């Protein structure tokens, strides 16, 4: 009569946040619901949450005067050392000289330096894309995730302006937050949505940067987790197991 | 007086397709032009070609009834073997059990199988994203590229329908092509834009697929190369060296 832990685990896979003994009937009910959810997505919008969020965020920053960057995901291992990373044990190495980027900063540093030769002050850029870190199991971490990093360099690089961009950005997405403060974290309850920095910092010199700057990095899967009230960030990930938070194991 | 080969190489970095002794003046002219090009992008649209193309392609397929997939880039090595790949020497391995995906097929096979339990016939899906292959130097190949793979499974999986989708798709993008024919290549002159397949094929059984299907895979950087008349596909890649085909080394 009482559901086993394994049965409960199975039902929880099929349970969605907005949902409101014997196991087989409960399972059948949830299977029907989830099939109908996929059918509705297929019939109507057909957009993947992670893709759609990237597009929405892209529009926000492009509209605010930030240049869209698409830089390599596979980066030189040298960039890790040059980032002052002696995270060191979290790097996915590829061949002898490369790794999967654990963050967007090194390529954006290079872009800021290069673009400063061409673009008027201030320089405003952003990137959204895959980042990789070896992580311990956890409901808030993925080994394959998607970062947004925006930054501004030159005039107007104040904490006030950084907080303003963050605030406008999250109010646009409709995500509740608190900024907890040079360095700031953007929190949703106890979940970190972003780390933000008001530069300059001593690392800049290694990258040929000698101007003020502000920037922040956000995990898109974390944003989705909060927005859609997913219990586990796995529902928001690139996945074969979940589609828009709906189990594909039906 | 005569430009050296190295000087010509430098000028060719700065030359754009639409452009129409002494070296320093030629260099200065091209530098000014390319800075102005970046300034215009920054002032006006601010979109990255590779990002924008992905968005345009996404809209095309979503509008045509195809479900947008975002699946893992880091995939089990087992998937390679299960794809009948004994390309074998082109795989970027990561740790003991994983690799960077060289193609979108294995994850899409899994999606087709899973979605067949939920969605009405025919099942139409697509993915756009990073793929990785170790390649010899060449003007048409990147080690890090972006694939579009669409497919349909069930009813209507005919060569005629596959050719129709391809034709509508490339006429939409404004890319000239010829389809050269079960299996088809979509050519732009001697450059392969896509390989396409009319299933079923014997590989399907390994992935739990036993329905007719059609599908095709396109390289986005190749599409950009053709569309923008880039001499080298490096101008279309995720890069720190080129932005929308414009040298960042100014
Ligand atoms: N493994 C991960 N999975 C999902 N999102 C991540 C992961 N690592 C970082 N992020 C996201 O990227 C943002 C910026 O990266 P940062 O390096 O500041 O993370 P972090 O300080 O290591 O986070 P945490 O303390 O939660 O590990 C984080 O605020 C988070 O939103
Ligand atoms: N290394 C690469 N760089 C850029 N695009 C690629 C690369 N490999 C494949 N593609 C693109 O992906 C498409 C489908 O992949 P497929 O495995 O059929 O390529 P392929 O037959 O190996 O191509 P090629 O003969 O040019 O190496 C190709 O038609 C091409 O547009
Ligand atoms: N790099 C991640 C995310 C931090 C985002 C804030 N930093 C930031 O925007 O750096 C700018 C990007 C290129 C150099 C300046 C971290 O280590 O927390
Ligand atoms: N996989 C690449 C691209 C081929 C694209 C055509 N194949 C295709 O769409 O396969 C479908 C995708 C999942 C299984 C059926 C190749 O090896 O050529
Ligand atoms: Mg961390
Ligand atoms: Mg942090
Ligand atoms: Mg090849
Ligand atoms: Mg081919």
Curated annotation (Swiss-Prot), chains A, B:
GO cellular component assignments: cytoplasm
EC number in record: 6.1.1.26
Keyword check for Aminoacyl-tRNA synthetase: yes
Reaction(s) this enzyme catalyzes, per UniProt: tRNA(Pyl) + L-pyrrolysine + ATP = L-pyrrolysyl-tRNA(Pyl) + AMP + diphosphate
Keywords tagged on the record: Aminoacyl-tRNA synthetase, ATP-binding, Cytoplasm, Ligase, Nucleotide-binding, Protein biosynthesis
Subcellular location as annotated: Cytoplasm
One GO-annotated biological process of the protein: tRNA aminoacylation for protein translation
Protein's UniProt keywords contain Cell division: no
Uppermost EC category: ligase
A GO term for molecular function: pyrrolysyl-tRNA synthetase activity
Role, per record: Catalyzes the attachment of pyrrolysine to tRNA(Pyl). Pyrrolysine is a lysine derivative encoded by the termination codon UAG.
Protein family (similarity comment): Belongs to the class-II aminoacyl-tRNA synthetase family.
Protein name, per record: Pyrrolysine--tRNA ligase
Gene name of the record: pylS
Included stretch of the parent chain: 188 to 454 of 454
């Amino acid at each position: 009569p009482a559901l086993t832990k394994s049965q409960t685990d199975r039902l929880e896979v099929l349970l969605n946040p907005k949902d409101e003994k014997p196991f087989r009937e409960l399972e059948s009910e949830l299977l029907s619901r989830r099939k109908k959810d996929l059918q509705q997505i297929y019939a109507e919008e057909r957009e993947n949450y992670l893709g759609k969020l990237e597009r929405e965020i892209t529009r926000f920053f492009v509209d605010r005067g930030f240049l869209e960057i698409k830089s390599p995901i596979l980066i030189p291992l040298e960039y890790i050392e040059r980032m002052g990373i002696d995270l060191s044990k979290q790097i996915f190495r590829v061949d002898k000289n490369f790794c999967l980027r654990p963050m967007l900063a090194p390529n954006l540093y290079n872009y800021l330096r290069k673009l400063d030769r061409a673009l008027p002050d201030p320089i405003k850029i952003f990137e959204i894309g895959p980042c990789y870190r070896k992580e311990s199991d956890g409901k808030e971490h993925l080994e394959e995730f998607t970062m947004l990093n925006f930054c501004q360099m030159g005039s107007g690089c104040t904490r006030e302006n950084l907080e303003s961009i963050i605030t406008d950005f999250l109010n646009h997405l409709g995500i509740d937050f608190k900024i907890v403060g040079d360095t700031l974290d953007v929190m949703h309850g106890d979940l970190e949505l972003s780390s933000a920095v008001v530069g300059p910092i001593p690392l800049d010199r290694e990258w040929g940067i000698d101007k003020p700057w502000i920037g922040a990095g956000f995990g898109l899967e974390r944003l989705l987790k909060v927005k859609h009230d997913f219990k586990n960030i796995k529902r928001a990930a690139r996945s074969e197991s979940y589609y828009n938070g709906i189990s594909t194991n039906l």
